[PDB]
Symmetry: C2
Subunit: 260 residues, 2 copies
């Protein structure tokens, strides 16, 4: 029973918890399936809970985070209106998943108040951030990274902080968040360079020559370094070291050559 | 500074808290103006907090409720997507207002879990309820009422419970939510009978079912009188919110007097009234519609009526056996 076996079971359990929840509140098969197809979004709560030593607590925080992350993904589907999904379903299941997550997270938190503290603290940075992102599109790496710091880093940073708040004492909360913010930007770049083929896209700027390949490599190496430092803070999440390498190397080896 | 002046001030203070909070998140002026226009959504929290004795707590709860009610209104605008407002602003301001409401309410709650408990308890009823409302359009009053009890009654009942949970001591939790649920249905009928023309709404719409013939006017009156009675009962429960009695009457009577007649017509209030009397030895009954002239002689009401053809009828009844309709023609003749 290695780390891959824990990750795979966590991912399956998060998926089942989300799909049961979407189904019982009236989600159509198409909306249930859409939800089941959010692979990395169902998997990333396992990474965020790597510092949680009680295996029962860890599975309960992981699936609570999966409900809210999926909820925020459906809200994001609702603002783009481009899935061909029923907007009533999208909106109603979005609210249902989010309210369940609030309840599951508040019942695991040392201090239930800490859930609403973390969600309010940078709500304006996150929500005002997403508005500015979709208004003025990026024209160089500086602007791309600034925007990806909100809908990517601040977005996962919050779930990092929530995993530390509900994962039992001792967790180095600042390092969990630091990990989430660095990892989020690696996978946001990945998504950008995948979702070009599938206007402020890093892929487009790379291909037009507004952004240079070596700069993207340097950012990825900076984010790798930031993620490795965060998981070496005491106590430490050594399990995340191969994870940081896997997602970073994948952008360098498989995705960068598609745009250069 | 009586109850009408407190109620205006509370809406204006909720409006200020909500519009500032929308502007600070990067909501455009149009979206700020949209939330400012939600007058009843902004006032309703004043009704829900009427039982709160400490006025600094009252104003805090009231504005925190306004934040989440408006947020959920933005979510609704985002699912219909017909406002012309930017979808990204609606979603991001929706989330932001909601997260600020959770923080403010959790700061005032007796229990740290009470807010998320109330929001979770009937989340499936509310969320699955709204899905089925748009999935399967109501074709009669029973169906209209069952749909309306989720996105109206359950919707506001939750803010009722949160007002009680966040409103310190002397809150009859069950009665506050009872009032919210009955009042929400009164308000939801008013919206349907209004938004028929304001929004051009047809499928599942109560005004359409009334005009179509699918729902009878008298059944609508009875439901309004039931919701009035339910709301009056809730605000009479000790320690009482007597300030809410004229508010219940105002909204119910407005549906009865102003909106109903636009969908019923000549006389949509049930059966045509009659006058019973004896005349030349026979039992007689005439419809108010056939009564020509009507006048008073002591306690007696004397009158003529169209008997069919050119023939004119004659009668006199005691004022004790006169229908209100005949006595009204007395006053207006």
């Amino acid at each position: 029973v290695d780390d891959d076996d824990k990750m795979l079971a966590a991912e399956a359990a998060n998926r089942d918890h989300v799909t049961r929840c979407v189904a019982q509140t009236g989600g159509s098969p198409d909306l249930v399936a859409h939800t089941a197809a959010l692979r990395l979004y169902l998997r990333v709560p396992h990474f965020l809970t790597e510092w949680t030593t009680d295996p029962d607590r860890r599975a309960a925080v992981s699936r609570a985070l999966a409900l809210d992350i999926v909820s925020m993904k459906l809200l994001d589907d609702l603002m783009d209106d481009d899935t061909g999904l029923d907007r009533v379903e999208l909106a109603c299941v979005c609210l249902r998943l989010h309210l369940r997550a609030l309840h599951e997270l508040e019942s695991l938190a040392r201090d239930p108040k800490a859930v609403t503290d973390i969600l309010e603290q940078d709500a304006v940075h996150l929500c005002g951030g997403q508005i500015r992102t979709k208004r003025s599109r990026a024209t160089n790496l500086r602007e791309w990274r600034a925007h990806a710091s909100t809908y990517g880093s601040t977005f996962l940073g919050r779930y990092g902080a929530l995993a530390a708040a509900c994962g039992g004492e001792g967790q180095p909360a600042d390092s969990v968040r630091e990990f989430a913010e660095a990892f989020a930007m690696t996978i946001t770049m990945a998504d950008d360079l995948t979702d070009y083929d599938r206007d402020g896209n890093l892929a487009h700027l790379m291909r037009t020559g507004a952004v240079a390949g070596q700069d993207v490599v340097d950012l990825l190496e900076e984010l790798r370094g930031r993620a490795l430092a965060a998981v070496a803070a005491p106590p430490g999440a050594p399990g995340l070291v191969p994870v940081v390498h896997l997602y970073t190397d994948d952008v360098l080896v498989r995705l960068l050559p598609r745009h250069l």
